[PDB]
Structure 1
Amino acid sequence: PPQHQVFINFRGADLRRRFVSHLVTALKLNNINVFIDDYEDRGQPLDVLLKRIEESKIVLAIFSGNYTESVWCVRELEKIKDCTDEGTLVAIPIFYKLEPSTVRDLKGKFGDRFRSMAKGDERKKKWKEAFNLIPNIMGIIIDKKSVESEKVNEIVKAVKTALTGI
């Protein structure tokens, strides 16, 4: 098992090819071991993902507009939330081009996709509370006036700090 692992949790092939590709290049540059999420839901087994998350020390939860279309991604967040409550990992919420309140209160396009995917599902309530609580962890914001390269450096800094602290 690897044990200076950073888990990068998110969805979107466009996000993987763009912003995340730079974040990944900067982490590797700093010899930090990272695990990339199944961003296409190309069907890596859910138990493998949830286990990788548990084996991590850091999780970067990158909330984008596509996060709530995936039942598996939402299950990952639940697992994130469960693990932080047992104290086995540092979680850092990243808000990619949406406001945190949008996430917390499941507003707009973000929540509409969530409500559509979770219609008539028993676990809906528990999921709703996770989205309400994870954005209270300190976290990092990226809006359209943000200099992305600076935000990448800011995230890498937070990761270095968290890793020395463990």
Structure 2
Amino acid sequence: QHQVFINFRGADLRRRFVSHLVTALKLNNINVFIDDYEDRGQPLDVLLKRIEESKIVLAIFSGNYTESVWCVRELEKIKDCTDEGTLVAIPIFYKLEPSTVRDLKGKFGDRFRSMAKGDERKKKWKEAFNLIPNIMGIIIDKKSVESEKVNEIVKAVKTALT
């Protein structure tokens, strides 16, 4: 039923920038599935299956992304799918830089290191975060006009669909 999976964390993000992004995609007749952005405990196998069935994933990195072990395992799946070529991924950097993601800097990184302490999957996760930004994405920084960025993402999704 969906073409686009929107991968992210944060209730505030859901209610603000993502609400506008989802509205614009639906306005452009694009069907989307919204992530378990609050980690209520929606079954991981279903999320991963949703990701696999998608044509496009928007991986929206923000400061809250790395707090969730589940969100990080979704990224693993995103990366596996993109490597094999079964889906198209578009990284979105919401108020952070691609370098912050690839090098795990700042709050984004600190939260990752806190979450992944002692976890044997840590190295594979770092690699996913290092590599995904090698795909060309869209940056929303503190000085961006958000409506313009919504339009930018919608145009990219349409291009990827057609």
* Runs of 4 or more consecutive aligned structure 1 residues displaced over 4 Å after TM superposition: none
Segments of structure 1 that go 5 or more residues without pairing to the other structure are none
1:9 and 1:60 in contact (8 A); partners too: yes
2:57 and 2:89 in contact (8 A); partners too: yes
Give the aligned partner of residue 71 of structure 1: 69
Give the aligned partner of residue 159 of structure 1: 157
Change (3 A) 1:4 1:162: farther
In the TM superposition, what is the alpha-carbon distance from 1:43 to its structure 2 partner?
Answer: 1.0
Segments of structure 2 that go 5 or more residues without pairing to the other structure are none
**DSSP 3-state at the match of 1:102:** helix
Task: State the Cα deviation string for residues 118-144 of structure 1 (Å, max 9, x = none).
Answer: 110110000000000001100000001
Count residues with an aligned counterpart.
162
Task: State the Cα deviation string for residues 52-72 of structure 1 (Å, max 9, x = none).
Answer: 000000000000000000000
TM-score by length of 2: 0.98
1:56 and 1:89 in contact (8 A); partners too: yes
In the TM superposition, what is the alpha-carbon distance from 1:108 to its structure 2 partner?
Answer: 1.2
2:5 and 2:34 in contact (8 A); partners too: yes
Q: Tell me the percent identity.
A: 100
Cα separation, 1, equivalents of 2:112 and 2:6: 20
In the TM superposition, what is the alpha-carbon distance from 1:4 to its structure 2 partner?
Answer: 5.5
Cα separation, 2, equivalents of 1:52 and 1:6: 10
Task: State the Cα deviation string for residues 57-109 of structure 1 (Å, max 9, x = none).
Answer: 00000000000000000000000000001100000000000011010000111
RMSD: 0.8
Give the aligned partner of residue 129 of structure 1: 127
1:4 and 1:163 in contact (8 A); partners too: no
Cα separation, 2, equivalents of 1:109 and 1:15: 16
Task: State the Cα deviation string for residues 21-52 of structure 1 (Å, max 9, x = none).
Answer: 00000000011110000000011100000000
Cα separation, 1, equivalents of 2:94 and 2:55: 22
2:2 and 2:33 in contact (8 A); partners too: no
Cα separation, 1, equivalents of 2:157 and 2:106: 30
